[PDB]
Write a protein that binds this DNA or RNA. Structure first.
Ligand SMILES: [Mg+2]
Ligand SMILES: [Mg+2]
Length: 132
RNA sequence: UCGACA
DNA sequence: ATGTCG
Protein backbone atom coordinates (compact mmCIF):
# COMPACT_ATOMS: atom_id res chain seq x y z
CA UNK A 1 0.00 0.00 0.00
CA UNK A 2 2.94 2.33 -0.71
CA UNK A 3 1.80 4.26 -3.80
CA UNK A 4 5.04 3.89 -5.73
CA UNK A 5 3.88 6.23 -8.56
CA UNK A 6 4.46 9.31 -6.40
CA UNK A 7 6.81 12.15 -5.51
CA UNK A 8 8.45 12.06 -2.05
CA UNK A 9 9.75 15.28 -0.45
CA UNK A 10 11.74 16.03 2.70
CA UNK A 11 13.73 18.71 4.52
CA UNK A 12 17.38 18.57 5.66
CA UNK A 13 18.96 20.94 8.15
CA UNK A 14 22.05 21.95 10.05
CA UNK A 15 20.59 23.27 13.30
CA UNK A 16 16.93 23.87 13.99
CA UNK A 17 16.52 26.75 13.54
CA UNK A 18 19.39 26.63 11.16
CA UNK A 19 20.48 26.07 7.55
CA UNK A 20 17.50 24.50 5.70
CA UNK A 21 17.31 22.68 2.37
CA UNK A 22 14.78 20.31 0.81
CA UNK A 23 14.38 18.01 -2.15
CA UNK A 24 11.91 15.99 -4.12
CA UNK A 25 12.56 12.41 -5.40
CA UNK A 26 10.77 9.82 -7.45
CA UNK A 27 9.49 7.37 -4.86
CA UNK A 28 10.13 4.29 -7.14
CA UNK A 29 13.62 5.10 -8.32
CA UNK A 30 15.10 7.61 -5.86
CA UNK A 31 15.94 9.93 -8.70
CA UNK A 32 16.34 13.56 -7.43
CA UNK A 33 13.84 15.68 -9.30
CA UNK A 34 14.43 19.02 -7.55
CA UNK A 35 16.69 20.25 -4.73
CA UNK A 36 16.54 23.71 -3.19
CA UNK A 37 19.78 25.63 -2.46
CA UNK A 38 20.36 25.94 1.30
CA UNK A 39 18.49 28.78 3.00
CA UNK A 40 20.64 30.22 5.79
CA UNK A 41 18.09 30.23 8.61
CA UNK A 42 14.81 28.48 8.94
CA UNK A 43 12.92 25.81 10.82
CA UNK A 44 12.36 22.17 10.04
CA UNK A 45 8.64 22.66 9.67
CA UNK A 46 9.07 25.67 7.34
CA UNK A 47 11.29 23.52 5.11
CA UNK A 48 8.91 20.55 5.19
CA UNK A 49 6.16 22.99 4.10
CA UNK A 50 8.17 24.58 1.30
CA UNK A 51 9.04 21.07 0.06
CA UNK A 52 5.41 20.11 -0.28
CA UNK A 53 4.46 23.34 -2.01
CA UNK A 54 7.46 23.03 -4.35
CA UNK A 55 6.27 19.55 -5.15
CA UNK A 56 2.69 20.76 -5.91
CA UNK A 57 4.14 23.38 -8.26
CA UNK A 58 6.55 20.87 -9.89
CA UNK A 59 3.74 18.38 -10.58
CA UNK A 60 1.29 21.02 -11.77
CA UNK A 61 3.75 22.51 -14.24
CA UNK A 62 4.28 18.98 -15.69
CA UNK A 63 0.55 18.01 -15.79
CA UNK A 64 1.22 15.12 -13.39
CA UNK A 65 -1.47 13.68 -11.15
CA UNK A 66 1.01 11.83 -8.90
CA UNK A 67 0.49 12.17 -5.15
CA UNK A 68 3.08 13.67 -2.85
CA UNK A 69 4.46 11.90 0.20
CA UNK A 70 5.68 13.82 3.19
CA UNK A 71 6.60 12.60 6.70
CA UNK A 72 5.62 15.89 8.31
CA UNK A 73 2.21 15.98 10.01
CA UNK A 74 2.85 19.72 10.59
CA UNK A 75 3.55 20.58 7.04
CA UNK A 76 0.71 18.51 5.69
CA UNK A 77 -1.61 20.55 7.96
CA UNK A 78 -0.08 23.89 6.98
CA UNK A 79 -0.59 23.06 3.29
CA UNK A 80 -4.21 21.95 3.83
CA UNK A 81 -4.77 25.26 5.73
CA UNK A 82 -2.84 27.38 3.21
CA UNK A 83 -1.13 28.80 6.22
CA UNK A 84 2.24 28.13 7.83
CA UNK A 85 1.92 28.72 11.57
CA UNK A 86 5.62 29.14 12.31
CA UNK A 87 7.04 30.73 15.54
CA UNK A 88 10.33 31.61 14.01
CA UNK A 89 11.36 35.24 14.84
CA UNK A 90 11.28 37.84 11.98
CA UNK A 91 14.56 39.63 11.64
CA UNK A 92 16.99 40.29 8.85
CA UNK A 93 18.60 36.78 9.12
CA UNK A 94 15.11 35.07 8.78
CA UNK A 95 13.74 37.42 6.07
CA UNK A 96 14.59 35.00 3.21
CA UNK A 97 12.71 32.00 4.63
CA UNK A 98 9.77 34.09 5.63
CA UNK A 99 9.53 35.60 2.09
CA UNK A 100 9.59 32.08 0.60
CA UNK A 101 6.88 30.94 3.09
CA UNK A 102 4.75 33.98 2.25
CA UNK A 103 5.18 33.34 -1.54
CA UNK A 104 4.24 29.62 -1.04
CA UNK A 105 1.03 30.51 0.77
CA UNK A 106 0.33 33.00 -2.00
CA UNK A 107 0.77 30.30 -4.65
CA UNK A 108 -1.67 28.03 -2.75
CA UNK A 109 -4.19 30.90 -2.66
CA UNK A 110 -3.93 31.45 -6.46
CA UNK A 111 -3.83 27.93 -7.98
CA UNK A 112 -5.83 24.78 -7.92
CA UNK A 113 -4.51 21.29 -7.58
CA UNK A 114 -5.92 17.86 -6.92
CA UNK A 115 -2.64 16.24 -5.85
CA UNK A 116 -3.22 13.95 -2.89
CA UNK A 117 -0.84 14.88 -0.10
CA UNK A 118 -0.09 11.72 1.82
CA UNK A 119 1.58 10.85 5.05
CA UNK A 120 4.59 8.62 4.63
CA UNK A 121 4.27 5.87 7.26
CA UNK A 122 7.87 5.82 8.54
CA UNK A 123 7.15 3.39 11.30
CA UNK A 124 6.03 0.69 8.84
CA UNK A 125 8.08 1.59 5.74
CA UNK A 126 11.35 3.05 6.90
CA UNK A 127 12.69 6.53 6.21
CA UNK A 128 11.06 8.48 3.41
CA UNK A 129 12.99 8.20 0.13
CA UNK A 130 13.85 11.93 0.11
CA UNK A 131 15.50 11.79 3.57
CA UNK A 132 18.90 13.38 3.89
C1' U B 1 -0.26 16.43 32.45
C1' C B 2 1.05 14.28 28.22
C1' G B 3 0.82 11.76 23.31
C1' A B 4 2.53 12.05 18.35
C1' C B 5 5.07 13.72 13.79
C1' A B 6 9.58 15.68 12.49
C1' DA C 1 18.78 20.37 22.17
C1' DT C 2 14.39 22.58 18.79
C1' DG C 3 9.94 22.94 15.86
C1' DT C 4 5.13 21.91 15.70
C1' DC C 5 0.07 19.46 16.28
C1' DG C 6 -3.54 16.03 18.61
MG1 LIG D 1 10.76 14.97 7.16
MG1 LIG E 1 13.94 13.37 7.08
Amino acid sequence: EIIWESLSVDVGSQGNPGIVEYKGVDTKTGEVLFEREPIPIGTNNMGEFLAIVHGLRYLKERNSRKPIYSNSQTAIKWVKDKKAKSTLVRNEETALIWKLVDEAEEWLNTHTYETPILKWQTDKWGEIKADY
